[PDB]
């Protein structure tokens, strides 16, 4: 839609359950860059994604 | 149909109206027995059994 964010209405479900006893109170998503073999000229390296 | 992932139901009252065996991925309805009363007509004890 032109919003991410949705006017409509939908639920949910279950998905599974995992039990372990560890607190979680902060998360990080992880990012995967991909190799880029760039020529000489380009001058340009660092970071990808 | 149920949900991908359910397993039970329910009706009106708290009792349930669904059973799911994806192996044999069955859904059903639920209704209350059929129940029964009895009421007795007489004429009178005086004028016949
Ligand atoms: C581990 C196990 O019991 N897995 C079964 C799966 O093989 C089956 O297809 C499904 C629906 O029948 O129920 C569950
Ligand atoms: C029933 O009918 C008979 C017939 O007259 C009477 O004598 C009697 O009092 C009545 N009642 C009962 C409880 O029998």
Redesign the interface.
């Given at each position: 839609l032109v919003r991410d964010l949705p006017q409509g209405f939908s639920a949910l479900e279950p998905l599974v359950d995992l039990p372990i006893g560890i607190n979680i109170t902060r998360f990080q998503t992880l990012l995967a860059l991909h190799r880029s073999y760039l020529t000489p000229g380009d001058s340009s390296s660092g970071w990808t994604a | 149909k149920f949900?991908?992932?359910?397993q039970f139901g329910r009706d009106i009252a708290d009792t349930t109206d669904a059973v799911r065996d994806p192996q044999t991925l069955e859904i059903l309805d639920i209704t209350p027995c059929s129940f029964g009363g009895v009421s007795v007509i007489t004429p009178g004890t005086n004028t016949s059994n």
């Open positions: - | 949900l991908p992932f359910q």
